[PDB]
């Protein structure tokens, strides 16, 4: 009712099964604990003395009846069991905060995580976190400032533990506010974010590497088949593009079912199952769950990056022994695209 | 009770905004009127430390309704250039507001005030200023540098910082936090101005290239040709190489140090 931790000295915290009286069943004890946990995080205060009143009568009667104890516990459950969900869904804006998570965490926003890379490309070198660490968060908030999107936004913080290899984000969701989001869960969340940023960055590189249309063939015939990279850029583009489509269907479907389950059901413990099944499916279905498929895909990405590196430096169409590098890249890409038929298997 | 008493009865927002404007932080036009008189070379004693004269100039330049509690009377301290330190200005604050305006912090305010009047002195001295044409060129190679330093210190650091301090003390609601925020604001102006931490590494470069300006204007007067100055090449080389040292010192900040504050001015346009 009041939520006091350690009402007594011994003999958050959880059940101490060995000392539970036999006649009180384990199931009602589990019912007690969630009620206790709720108050730390209500209209319980409003009808507080009333519930204390029935508990006082249960004190008053001479002999103990489990049937009556259950009724009081259940009455407090109908007003705490679902009334923690009451405080989360309406007073804590659970549904609203999940939107903020996907928008600013799972690359659910276009502006903030595209203009950010555009105005933060320079952090490509290996950093010791001396300067780049500050500069990246500066770039993030500057990116947000371009078009509105300026309300709260204090909490999101980027951190550097290969300039783009480590950009781990941390959001400050407090334990008294939300027990749903946990350290491991935000960590699992973080693994997903780093992965999805990888694919977004490479496909930004390929759209920029589509510069033959922009300038080289643009007013200038130059040489075709004498000086061309075989336009492999576009098969390479297809592989990463379709992987992104893979991410789009998985994320949108899982998020739709998660927020429709949340709207339907009414017990926070079940809501927690819903969410831990959300993230659990996101991992395996996006393949971030460590696998040979993921290792081959990351090798594709590294071979995808090296091709961007080759075409970047050339400037005017010329083969400064570029054919050797291109031969290695084309052969490796064909070899590894063949490994991508393990999925077809 | 504290904040209202110190804002309606013994006005704290006004005492502090005074401490900023038309006083140590911001010169305004009052401090221009005050400063030009003390710069003037006519009827000037060697160090011009006559306290009655200084105080009289301050009361002439009070230029406000409350023309009180400002002395400019503290004994001047007894120098590659003239480089006259001293001139200390102490402002008398009553008891109900003293708690947040400490006699200790007064020193910090005075320290930045001294730098502000050195930089106004340097720019004004090269203003009071104006082979015979080559001197006219060296004037220009010098004014750009000093004016750019003045631009950074006067606006980028002190004005911008003072604006969030003015705004945030409105939100602040505690006698202790109002002290803490004020101490943060002073510890950040005093650091962003190159006046703590490494001194021989940074500060003396600006001081010596200021001293060269001070000699350059002290060894010249308006309206003749026969200066008979053969040191013009020595001063050219001196300013050039000390400038090289200055810009390289600022560029060393890339590896370590306060990059936001330094890499803003390290783009001094070089040549």
């Amino acid at each position: 009712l009041h939520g006091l931790l350690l009402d007594q000295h011994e003999e958050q915290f959880s059940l101490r099964v060995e000392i539970l009286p036999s006649y009180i069943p384990v199931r009602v004890a589990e019912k007690i604990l969630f009620v206790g946990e709720s108050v730390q995080m209500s209209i319980l205060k409003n009808q507080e003395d009333t519930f204390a009143a029935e508990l006082h009568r249960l004190k008053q009667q001479p002999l103990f009846s489990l049937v009556d104890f259950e009724q009081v516990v259940d009455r407090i459950r109908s007003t705490v069991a679902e009334h923690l969900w009451k405080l989360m869904v309406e007073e804590s804006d659970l549904l609203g905060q999940l939107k903020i998570i996907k928008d600013f965490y799972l690359l659910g926003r276009g502006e903030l995580f595209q203009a950010f890379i555009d105005t933060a490309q320079h952090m490509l070198k290996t950093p010791p976190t001396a300067v780049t660490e500050h500069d990246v968060n500066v770039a993030f908030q500057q990116s947000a400032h371009k078009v509105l999107l300026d309300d709260d936004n204090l909490l999101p913080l980027l951190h550097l533990t290969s300039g783009w290899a480590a950009l781990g984000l941390s959001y400050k969701v407090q334990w008294p506010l939300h027990i749903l989001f946990t350290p491991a869960v935000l960590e699992k969340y973080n693994v997903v974010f780093k992965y999805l940023l990888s694919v977004r960055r490479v496909q930004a590189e390929l759209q920029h590497c589509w510069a033959l249309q922009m300038q080289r063939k643009h007013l200038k015939s130059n040489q075709t088949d004498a000086i061309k990279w075989r336009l492999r850029n576009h098969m390479a583009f297809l592989v990463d593009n379709l992987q992104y489509y893979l991410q789009v269907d998985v994320l949108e479907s899982q998020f739709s079912q998660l927020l429709h389950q949340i709207n339907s059901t009414r017990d926070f413990e079940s809501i927690r199952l819903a969410h831990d099944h959300f993230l659990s499916n996101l991992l395996a279905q996006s393949f971030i769950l460590l696998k040979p498929v993921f290792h081959c895909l990351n090798e594709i990405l590294d071979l995808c990056h090296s091709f961007c590196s080759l075409v970047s430096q050339n400037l005017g169409p010329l083969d400064e022994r570029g054919a050797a590098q291109l031969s290695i890249l084309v052969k490796g890409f064909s070899r590894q695209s063949s490994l991508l038929f393990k999925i077809l298997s | 009770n504290l904040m209202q008493t110190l804002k309606k009865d013994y006005r704290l927002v006004e005492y502090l905004q005074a401490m900023r404007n038309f006083f140590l932080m911001e010169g305004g036009d009052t401090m221009y009127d005050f400063y030009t008189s003390i710069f003037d070379k006519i009827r000037e004693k060697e160090t011009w430390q006559n306290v009655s004269f200084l105080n009289v100039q301050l009361q002439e330049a009070v230029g406000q309704r409350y023309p009180e509690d400002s002395s400019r009377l503290s004994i001047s301290f007894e120098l590659p250039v003239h480089i006259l330190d001293g001139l200390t200005l102490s402002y008398k604050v009553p008891w109900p507001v003293d708690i947040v305006i400490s006699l200790e912090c007064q020193k910090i305010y005075n320290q930045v005030f001294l730098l502000l009047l050195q930089i106004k002195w340097a720019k004004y001295s090269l203003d009071v200023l104006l082979q015979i044409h080559r001197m006219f060129l060296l004037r220009v190679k010098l004014m750009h540098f000093v004016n750019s330093l003045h631009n950074y210190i006067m606006t980028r650091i002190l004005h911008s910082t003072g604006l969030e301090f003015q705004h945030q003390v409105e939100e602040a609601k505690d006698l202790d936090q109002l002290i803490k925020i004020h101490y943060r604001y002073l510890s950040t102006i005093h650091d962003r101005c190159l006046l703590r931490e490494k001194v021989s590494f940074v500060k003396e470069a600006i001081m010596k290239v200021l001293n060269l300006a001070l000699m350059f204007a002290d060894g010249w007067q308006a309206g003749l040709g026969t200066w008979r100055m053969e040191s013009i090449e020595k001063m050219e080389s001196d300013f050039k190489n000390c400038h090289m040292f200055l810009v390289t010192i600022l560029n060393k900040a890339v590896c370590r140090g306060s990059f936001p504050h330094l890499e803003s001015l390290a783009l001094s346009l070089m040549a």
Partner: protein
Amino acid sequence: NASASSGSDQGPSSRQHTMVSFLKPVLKQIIMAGKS
């Protein structure tokens, strides 16, 4: 601190001096009303 209407520097301490339990959360509030 300089305005030591409450010399808490010489008042509460962990070892040299002592502080009553029940009142621990409300210290600085008591001092602030005091400094007035």
